[PDB]
């Protein structure tokens, strides 16, 4: 159960990082995004 | 403690999904968003 | 392991909240964002 929770948390960390990058690009207009 | 952690993780998964949908709409201008 | 998982989850909660605020601002054009 715990190891599956860690795997869920690791996946959330990657998704959250992807979202931060996308939001920063929208906020700053990087490369016309 | 663990069951509460799972419940926290399940809630984060739903929020992260909501954020992905909103960010994709901003990125692609869907329906004028 | 569990206490470290909680600490990871607490950090994800803060990041997710930051992302919600930023996305809401982009969506609504608050203060010209």
């Amino acid at each position: 159960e715990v190891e599956a929770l860690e795997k869920k948390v690791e996946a959330l960390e990657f998704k959250v990082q992807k979202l931060e990058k996308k939001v920063e690009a929208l906020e700053h207009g990087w490369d016309g995004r």
Side-chain angles (χ1 to χ4, degrees), chain A:
Chain A
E1 189 155 349
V2 168
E3 197 192 288
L5 259 179
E6 331 209 308
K7 206 178 134 145
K8 260 183 185 214
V9 168
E10 171 271 341
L12 276 170
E13 290 183 323
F14 168 66
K15 297 176 175 203
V16 167
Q17 183 196 262
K18 285 192 312 190
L19 282 167
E20 288 172 341
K21 279 174 191 190
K22 295 182 172 264
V23 169
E24 288 304 328
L26 293 168
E27 266 172 333
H28 287 100
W30 294 335
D31 307 304
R33 297 173 261 189

